[PDB]
Design a protein around this motif. Structure first.
Motif, short mmCIF file in Angstrom:
data_model
loop_
_atom_site.label_atom_id
_atom_site.label_comp_id
_atom_site.label_asym_id
_atom_site.label_seq_id
_atom_site.Cartn_x
_atom_site.Cartn_y
_atom_site.Cartn_z
N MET A 1 0.85 -1.17 0.00
CA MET A 1 0.00 0.00 0.00
C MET A 1 0.89 1.22 0.00
SD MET A 1 -3.67 0.32 1.60
CE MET A 1 -4.35 -0.16 0.01
N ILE A 2 0.61 2.10 -0.96
CA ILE A 2 1.41 3.31 -1.10
C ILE A 2 1.28 4.17 0.14
CG2 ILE A 2 1.76 5.41 -2.52
CD1 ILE A 2 2.73 2.83 -3.72
N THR A 3 0.10 4.16 0.75
CA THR A 3 -0.13 5.01 1.91
C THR A 3 0.80 4.63 3.05
OG1 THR A 3 -2.31 5.92 1.61
CG2 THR A 3 -1.73 5.19 3.82
N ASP A 4 0.92 3.33 3.33
CA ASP A 4 1.83 2.91 4.39
C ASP A 4 3.29 3.01 3.96
OD1 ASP A 4 -0.47 2.49 5.91
OD2 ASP A 4 -0.57 0.34 5.53
N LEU A 5 3.57 3.02 2.65
CA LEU A 5 4.92 3.31 2.18
C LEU A 5 5.27 4.78 2.39
CD1 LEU A 5 7.56 2.61 0.78
CD2 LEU A 5 6.48 3.27 -1.37
N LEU A 6 4.34 5.69 2.07
CA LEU A 6 4.60 7.11 2.30
C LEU A 6 4.90 7.39 3.77
CD1 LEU A 6 1.66 8.50 0.11
CD2 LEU A 6 4.07 8.55 -0.59
N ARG A 7 4.40 6.56 4.69
CA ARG A 7 4.67 6.75 6.11
C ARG A 7 6.03 6.20 6.51
NH1 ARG A 7 -0.52 5.42 7.46
NH2 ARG A 7 -1.94 7.17 7.82
N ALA A 8 6.38 5.01 6.01
CA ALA A 8 7.67 4.42 6.34
C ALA A 8 8.83 5.27 5.82
CB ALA A 8 7.76 3.02 5.76
N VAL A 9 8.64 5.94 4.70
CA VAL A 9 9.67 6.78 4.11
C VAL A 9 9.67 8.18 4.72
CG1 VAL A 9 10.49 7.71 1.91
CG2 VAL A 9 9.48 5.44 2.05
N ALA A 10 8.50 8.67 5.13
CA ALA A 10 8.37 10.03 5.66
C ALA A 10 7.25 10.06 6.69
CB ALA A 10 8.08 11.03 4.54
N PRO A 11 7.52 9.57 7.91
CA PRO A 11 6.44 9.49 8.92
C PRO A 11 5.78 10.83 9.19
CG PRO A 11 8.42 8.33 9.67
CD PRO A 11 8.82 9.14 8.45
N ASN A 12 6.41 11.91 8.75
CA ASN A 12 5.90 13.26 8.92
C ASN A 12 5.35 13.85 7.63
OD1 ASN A 12 8.50 12.75 8.19
ND2 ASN A 12 9.38 14.57 9.19
N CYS A 13 5.22 13.05 6.58
CA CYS A 13 4.66 13.58 5.34
C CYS A 13 3.20 13.95 5.56
CB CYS A 13 4.80 12.56 4.20
SG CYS A 13 3.83 11.03 4.40
N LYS A 14 2.75 14.94 4.80
CA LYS A 14 1.40 15.45 4.94
C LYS A 14 0.41 14.47 4.32
CE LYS A 14 -1.34 18.91 6.20
NZ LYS A 14 -1.78 19.88 5.15
N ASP A 15 -0.65 14.14 5.08
CA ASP A 15 -1.82 13.39 4.62
C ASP A 15 -1.45 12.19 3.75
OD1 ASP A 15 -4.45 12.60 4.02
OD2 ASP A 15 -4.64 14.06 2.39
N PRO A 16 -0.77 11.18 4.28
CA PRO A 16 -0.36 10.05 3.44
C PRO A 16 -1.52 9.19 2.98
CG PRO A 16 0.12 9.57 5.71
CD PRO A 16 -0.34 11.00 5.69
N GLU A 17 -2.70 9.34 3.59
CA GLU A 17 -3.82 8.52 3.16
C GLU A 17 -4.58 9.16 2.02
OE1 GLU A 17 -5.58 6.47 6.83
OE2 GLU A 17 -4.92 8.42 7.62
N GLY A 18 -4.68 10.49 2.01
CA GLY A 18 -5.29 11.16 0.87
C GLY A 18 -4.44 11.06 -0.38
N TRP A 19 -3.13 11.30 -0.25
CA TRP A 19 -2.22 11.12 -1.38
C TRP A 19 -2.12 9.65 -1.77
CZ3 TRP A 19 -0.75 14.62 -4.65
CH2 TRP A 19 -0.65 15.95 -4.27
#
Ligand SMILES: [Br-]
Ligand SMILES: [Br-]
Length: 188
Positions: A1-19
């Motif tokens: 899941m891209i959403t959980d990848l966006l978190r592992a790479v950038a736990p502080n990235c903005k709105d990883p579930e919407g993106w």
């Protein structure tokens, strides 16, 4: 899941579930499917968008920085000073008569400044984006600030780069991008 990848790479990235919801079909449709392929894409996405917080080009430059980034357009300080701390004048001048844009007076440089998490820039690229995506981003370029078309444009931009890379084989800061990539590559 891209959403959980966006978190592992950038736990502080903005709105990883919407993106995440928007990036996934854009990636799948544009063939961003392979393991390393996904990791590099996400890394480039993460550094260019400031971990998903930036969707419009940064155009605030020192009087010094300009002379470096664009040494021809900004040769002396008398020149680079007028455009430092003036984002609109800056874009209209440095992007004038380039990538499809009209001259400085036309306003094209600012009108078609970089937009999207991975940025599309210049009248000719918005036009091409318009042709490929069927959305009137020539007249409404700020539609690339949305999650939906920013993701699709970000993914199409990476797809275009693989076409070029592929098309040559037939005819035979930067540390930031590295952090994300390996942090992403760590995921499988
Ligand atoms: Br306008
Ligand atoms: Br127009």
């Amino acid at each position: 899941m891209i959403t959980d990848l966006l978190r592992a790479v950038a736990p502080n990235c903005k709105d990883p579930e919407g993106w995440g919801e928007q990036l996934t079909p854009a990636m799948e449709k544009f063939g961003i499917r392979d393991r390393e392929d996904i990791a590099a894409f996400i890394a480039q996405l993460m550094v260019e968008s400031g971990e998903l917080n930036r969707v419009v080009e940064n155009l605030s430059y020192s009087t010094k920085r300009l002379r470096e980034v664009w040494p021809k357009r900004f040769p002396d300080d008398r020149t680079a000073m007028r455009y430092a701390n003036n984002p609109q004048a800056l874009a209209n001048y440095v992007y004038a008569n380039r990538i499809g844009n009209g001259n400085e007076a036309s306003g094209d440089g600012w009108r078609f400044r970089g937009r999207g998490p991975i940025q599309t820039t210049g009248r000719a690229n918005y036009l091409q984006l318009e042709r490929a995506l069927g959305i009137p981003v020539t007249r409404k370029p700020e539609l690339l600030e949305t999650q939906a078309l920013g993701a699709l444009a970000a993914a199409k931009f990476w797809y275009d780069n693989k076409l070029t890379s592929l098309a040559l084989d037939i005819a035979g800061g930067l540390a930031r991008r590295r952090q994300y990539r390996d942090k992403a590559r760590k995921h499988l």
